Amino acid sequence: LSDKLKEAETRAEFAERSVTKLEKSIDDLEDELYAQKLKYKAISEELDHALNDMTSI
Amino acid sequence: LNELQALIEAHFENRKKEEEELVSLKDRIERRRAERAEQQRIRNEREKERQNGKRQTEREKKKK
Amino acid sequence: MDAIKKKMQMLKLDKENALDRAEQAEADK
Numbered sequence: 001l002s003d004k005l006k007e008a009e010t011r012a013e014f015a016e017r018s019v020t021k022l023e024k025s026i027d028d029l030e031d032e033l034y035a036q037k038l039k040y041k042a043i044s045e046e047l048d049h050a051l052n053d054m055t056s057i
Numbered sequence: 058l059n060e061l062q063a064l065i066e067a068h069f070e071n072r073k074k075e076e077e078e079l080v081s082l083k084d085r086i087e088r089r090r091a092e093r094a095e096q097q098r099i100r101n102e103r104e105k106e107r108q109n110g111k112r113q114t115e116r117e118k119k120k121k
Numbered sequence: 122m123d124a125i126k127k128k129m130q131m132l133k134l135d136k137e138n139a140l141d142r143a144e145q146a147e148a149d150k
Contacts, residue, residue, distance in 0.1 A: 023094050030087040037083060041076050052069055055124035065124065 027091055027094065030090045034084060034087050037080060041080065045073050045076050049069070049073065051122060051124070052065070055122045055128070057125075057128070061124065061127065
């Protein structure tokens with residue numbers, strides 16, 4: 001049990017670290033998805049707004 | 058022309074208004090994510106709180 | 122930019138027709 005605990009603790013710590021890595025990667029995806037949407041629909045949708053004007057004339 | 062102008066205005070309004078809806082709400086989602094993550098961080102803080110010579114003498118001589 | 126593929130065609134027709142006339146007007150002598 002001491003080893004099972006160290007192992008479970010390694011697993012708990014692993015999961016805390018894995019969660020930490022994923023806390024970081026979820027935030028990176030939360031920020032990257034955010035940034036990509038924020039820049040991508042905001043720019044390309046803006047480019048389609050610009051289409052409204054670009055294709056006028 | 059009624060068909061083209063009507064459809065492209067439907068495009069503008071409906072779709073991009075909708076796109077900003079998406080922007081807003083997805084931002085809400087991400088904010089939820091980050092705030093709840095930080096809250097877990099503070100929880101972990103609290104829980105781990107629950108889980109809890111001779112040279113000196115001669116120097117003193119000379120310096121004093 | 123289909124709006125202008127279509128506007129292009131309209132203006133193309135307007136000029137082609139004006140041009141057809143420019144060419145005829147000169148061709149007529």
